[PDB]
Amino acid sequence: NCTFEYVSFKNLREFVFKNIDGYFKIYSKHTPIIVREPEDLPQGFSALEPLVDLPIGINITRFQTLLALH
Amino acid sequence: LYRLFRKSNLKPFERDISTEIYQAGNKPCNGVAGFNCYFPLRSYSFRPTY
Ligand SMILES: *[C@@H]1O[C@H](CO)[C@@H](O[C@@H]2O[C@H](CO)[C@@H](O[C@@H]3O[C@H](CO[C@H]4O[C@H](CO)[C@@H](O)[C@H](O)[C@@H]4O)[C@@H](O)[C@H](O[C@H]4O[C@H](CO)[C@@H](O)[C@H](O)[C@@H]4O)[C@@H]3O)[C@H](O)[C@H]2NC(C)=O)[C@H](O)[C@H]1NC(C)=O
Numbered sequence: 819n820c821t822f823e824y825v826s827f828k829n830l831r832e833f834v835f836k837n838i839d840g841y842f843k844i845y846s847k848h849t850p851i852i853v854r855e856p857e858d859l860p861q862g863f864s865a866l867e868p869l870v871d872l873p874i875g876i877n878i879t880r881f882q883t884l885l886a887l888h
Numbered sequence: 889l890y891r892l893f894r895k896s897n898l899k900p901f902e903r904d905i906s907t908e909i910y911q912a913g914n915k916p917c918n919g920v921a922g923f924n925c926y927f928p929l930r931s932y933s934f935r936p937t938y
Pocket residue numbers: 877878879895896897898899
């Protein structure tokens with residue numbers, strides 16, 4: 819079901835996925851950090867504004883990420 | 889078609905569209921329909937004379 823379709827090192831992306839009562843809530847924040855060592859998360863405070871609310875109603879216990887390769 | 893058997897009760901505002909055979913008995917069905925392996929979806933056959 820393709821129900822929802824939307825078209826809108828130097829970059830850190832933070833997301834929170836939260837599945838409550840059949841609602842998938844995605845909070846997001848993008849920040850342009852400059853850090854020499856990417857071995858650790860940077861020290862600081864970033865507030866995550868809410869982005870996406872989906873009434874999918876599915877049951878989730880596992881997840882995986884997608885990569886772009888050539 | 890109405891569901892009659894489930895492993896557990898659903899969470900609110902959730903759906904389960906899988907039509908797999910439930911293990912009604914302790915014997916494993918393993919994809920075989922039979923006794924103690926009842927199909928979950930059963931219709932009611934609605935008639936105006938009921
Ligand atoms: C969303 O989707 C997930 C996954 O698809 C569902 O997760 C289920 O989670 C339960 C609990 O983890 C799984 O139940 C397992 O059942 C095995 C068989 O036990 C049968 O008999 C007992 C009575 O003795 C019944 O209660 C049970 O329902 C079975 O009929 C057990 O052997 C398992 O125990 C093992 O794992 C637990 C940890 O979970 C250990 O503590 C134990 O020591 C043992 O190693 C376990 O109890 C069930 O199989 C999962 N379902 C699926 C499809 O994988 C969620 O339920 C679902 N959400 C909703 C709302 O439905």
